[PDB]
Amino acid sequence: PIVQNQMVHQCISPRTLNAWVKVVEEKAFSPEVIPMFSALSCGATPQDLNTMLNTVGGHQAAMQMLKETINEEAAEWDRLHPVHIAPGQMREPRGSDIAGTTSTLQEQIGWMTHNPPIPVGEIYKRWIILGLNKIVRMYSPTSILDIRQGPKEPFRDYVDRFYKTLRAETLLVQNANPDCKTILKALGPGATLEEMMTACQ
Amino acid sequence: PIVQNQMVHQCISPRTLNAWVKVVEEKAFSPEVIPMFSALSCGATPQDLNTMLNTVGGHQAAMQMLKETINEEAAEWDRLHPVHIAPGQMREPRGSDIAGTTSTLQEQIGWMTHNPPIPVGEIYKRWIILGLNKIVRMYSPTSILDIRQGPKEPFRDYVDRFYKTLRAETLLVQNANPDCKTILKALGPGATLEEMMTACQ
Amino acid sequence: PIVQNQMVHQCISPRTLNAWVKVVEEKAFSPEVIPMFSALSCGATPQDLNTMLNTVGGHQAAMQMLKETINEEAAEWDRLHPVHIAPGQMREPRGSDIAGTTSTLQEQIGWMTHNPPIPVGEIYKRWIILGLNKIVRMYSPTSILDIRQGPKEPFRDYVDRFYKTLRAETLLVQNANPDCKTILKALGPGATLEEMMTACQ
Amino acid sequence: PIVQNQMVHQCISPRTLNAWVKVVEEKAFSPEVIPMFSALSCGATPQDLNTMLNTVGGHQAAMQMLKETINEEAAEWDRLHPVHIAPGQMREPRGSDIAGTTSTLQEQIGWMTHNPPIPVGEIYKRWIILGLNKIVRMYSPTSILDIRQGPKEPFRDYVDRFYKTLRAETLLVQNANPDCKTILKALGPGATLEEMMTACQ
Amino acid sequence: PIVQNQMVHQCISPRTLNAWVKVVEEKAFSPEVIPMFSALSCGATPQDLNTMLNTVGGHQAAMQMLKETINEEAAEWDRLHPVHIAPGQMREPRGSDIAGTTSTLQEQIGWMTHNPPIPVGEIYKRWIILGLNKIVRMYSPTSILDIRQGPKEPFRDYVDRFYKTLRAETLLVQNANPDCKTILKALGPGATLEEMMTACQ
Amino acid sequence: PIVQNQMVHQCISPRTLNAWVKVVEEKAFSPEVIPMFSALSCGATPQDLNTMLNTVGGHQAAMQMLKETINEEAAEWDRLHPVHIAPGQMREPRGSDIAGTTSTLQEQIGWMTHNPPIPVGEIYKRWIILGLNKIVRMYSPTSILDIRQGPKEPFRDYVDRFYKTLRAETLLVQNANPDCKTILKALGPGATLEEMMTACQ
């Protein structure tokens, strides 16, 4: 990553490397892996971002899809920012430079610490999360339409499933079981979630 | 977080990230999770606070309720502090800025390190703990009225349950078993907890 | 805590937070938990001390007793140091300020780093350990009078139990078994512990 | 490694040492071990690189092959950069110097921190990864030609295997099972991977 | 401990605290615990040394014996260095000051960082190791006279036991079994251990 | 160890201490323990080196042999560098000084940071590794002559054993099984290891 000492490059830590690999092993593409990815990649160069992605051993279908999305964003970057070098001067980054496949670490450091800064690490991270979100959506196992409260399922457990599904991807009341539904309907309009859960507790 | 070097931004640590996720996995919304949250979020920006909340994978009912409380505090903030920008100057934060959904990290850093400082991290944390407390209360499994000493339950174990329940949510003596109750009644008024526990030991 | 960089505030560490919670989970109120508490709270502000106590999830009877002792010391502090503020100036701390319930972190930092320093962290820690010691004493399971060497119990194991009990709360010889007692009596006056243990080895 | 303080030598960490040894124990020569190796060897001197390789206890066939590749690159280096010393002056590195077998740490530090820098750590790392890639290829257990979707194998699981094999080492559709193949064929030309996987989901 | 920044006090680490407690739990008073103690107490003040000893929960017989030895060394210190204070000046340390029971941390820091330094941490550590060595000796389970090679015991295993016993507390050959003894006797005078072990391998 | 801040002494870390003790517990004297020892002792003083050796609890036969080798190197040092002190001046180190048994830490620091430096830590480490190598050789369980490919043993597994044995201590082809041997013989002269392994794969 790049962090302050002056902004300077620091080696990615074994702790960071292991944390990412483990989250993926343990959580796959559950939605909460994305915020973890973003935090673990705080201050990351494109090189660092590639390191994190490349250290993943499984899920190679997903990792290929991600490359596809990345290449799509890089092409759109090239469409909006065509590049044209002068001895000793900073060149303009193209898509594959931001994605760290045709740029060196030193070039990335130069862009990231220039004045004004060209935040290639942040730009690349945005593309990666765009791709990751597609994957989270794809690997979501259930439709919100199929999340319905069971006959003796605690309302809390049902709401947990409902919003967990919504995150991966009136209905709450509709999909509630008969007993709870009657209670919720009587609540009247404008009830908060807290109120509904207390009601069916 | 923001910490001294001068106050500067530091990336949230893998240790901090894991600690929070693990406490929630292991303790759910037992009351002692709140002090842990506050300590783990020492010096946190709103971005950091969102990271911590968002990295939680389960309990999505609770996490939705929390969003509700947060939006309520943000609206009250907007009611008390309407915002009106000048080139190069600091804008005033609105509710959603303090909650980190419409403000950038750099803006948050600017507010937090301004003179005088606008402690958006501390303001947001207060809202979050307000919401968390509601959840702790909701998920409290038992009424203090239902905590009564068992026939052969050690007084100490009963007092543990009693104050554990009180924390999540004369009575102590009333709910004690007959044998202990007689002892405690004879103690007379003004007895400390230490005295009562020694008495029924 | 407060530590040198100049004395400055540092966030309490996840390592420190976990260590304390784990010692309590694993050792309860065995006497050796107190020295651990004191060391883990090296340089602690009152806020930090409250964090450590509050992160404990079990033993709520004990934690209530501790609050009682703390309030007693705070009242005695107020009796000896009545407080009377001038714009921009440091106010005098009352009991509840030292206990961190009515003082802010910044006020605590101000007191702790003033010249001369008002060591509110050290004063509060003394009160807490006073209360903790009462609890260790209360939860001590056995009287030293009931620690007697078994017929075929190794002398070393008996001495371990004896001094372990003494810590939680002539007698050594008296409570020794017949065979060892005869040996020890013949040792004559003034024998060290090392000498007694070698003798009955 | 060499890192900034000025560039200075830092001892390789126990964390780094253990991480590498463990990845090899746990993952052998699966392709994702290479990006991990490169990241764990961030800033490494040739001495550090040798340390990492030499701390591996198993896989001695592979480690011998790696030495072979290294010696081949060192010979080609010597062919392109013949060396010819002046009292107090920096000598030119030969192949075995870059590979750290005939150069001292101080010499390596001198080369790496000279102006202009002679990046012997980076040059050696390139040779090592060249050799490691050969090994990954050798230890790849299956031909991409033998990766075919099973009768009731989820398309996602099949694509995972396919790209995992491709990494170690039209075909995707050809090797898909009859049911999925029909769907994919109807998709028409130009379908992305995301589209194919959704189609056969 | 005291370490350089200038020599300054640093809080004892949770890592250090746990390491010591664990070694004692896992190894008791095996001889190798002493070098570990000395290393873990690198730079320790007397306060730190007391912390380490006091955090031990078991072995209270041993811990009492240690106090006895410590008091004996402190008395001999007082015999050789009688103490006689001037406003603002450093007082001379007595035995119990070096042992940290009647001296404050600030006094210990003052002594340890004075010019010339009065190394109270090192002096106390010497006393503690003197006491620990007595305990290692006491808890040594076997006499070197009872370490004899078994009929089919590998010579290496026998030598391991022999020198392990010697550490806790011609003979090597004498106690070897008949077959090995014959070989060793034929070796002639002056044979190294390596030679003997190779011979009976 | 000694490291830069200026070169200064740093306490050996609990992480380093534990890593070494664990490697020995887990790997005994397998050859890869030596590179680990050298890396973990980066920057070590003789005191540190003794700490590492002395913290080992088992293998006391080996540890005695090591002392023997160390004393032999120290005697040869004394033969080549006889020592002859001037008030305030640095004395010359003898063998036992380099081995840290008759020199203080401060003396070791003085030698190691003098200009020109007298690298007593590096000199001692060389002696220790000389002794360790003897032990690795001694504890090697099998002769390379007894490493022969089994009838249905994969060539790769056989080569692993062969070079693992060679490390602890034409033949490769000779010791290969009949089927593989025929293939290898037909390969002709000059075949690399990679080529042989591919051939018999």
Helix content of chain A: 55-70%
- The coarse overall form of chain A would be elongated
Order of helices and strands of chain A: EEHHHHHHHHHHH
The total count of helices of chain A amounts to: 11
Structural class of chain A: mainly alpha
Task: State the domain count of chain A.
Answer: 2
Cα gyration radius of chain A (Å): 23 Å
Spatial strand order of the main sheet of chain A: 1-2
- Could you state the oligomeric state of the chains shown? homohexamer
Strand count, sense and barrel status of the largest sheet of chain A are:
2 strands, antiparallel
| Chains forming the largest contact | A-B, 32 and 28 residues
CATH topology of the largest domain in chain A: Human Immunodeficiency Virus Type 1 Capsid Protein
The top-level CATH class of the largest domain in chain A is Mainly Alpha
Strand content of chain A: under 5%
Structure overview:
Six copies of one chain form a homohexamer. The first copy, chain A, is mainly alpha-helical. The first copy, chain A, folds into two domains: 1-143, Human Immunodeficiency Virus Type 1 Capsid Protein (Orthogonal Bundle), CATH 1.10.375; 144-201, Non-ribosomal Peptide Synthetase Peptidyl Carrier Protein, Chain A (Orthogonal Bundle), CATH 1.10.1200. Helix content of chain A is 59%, strand content 3%. Chain A contains eleven helices and two strands. The first copy, chain A, has a two-stranded antiparallel ribbon. In chain A, a hairpin with a 2-residue loop joins β1 and β2 (7-9). In chain A, α1 (14-27) packs antiparallel against α2. The longest helix of chain A has 21 residues, at 60-80. Chain A is elongated. The first copy, chain A, starts with a strand and ends with a helix.
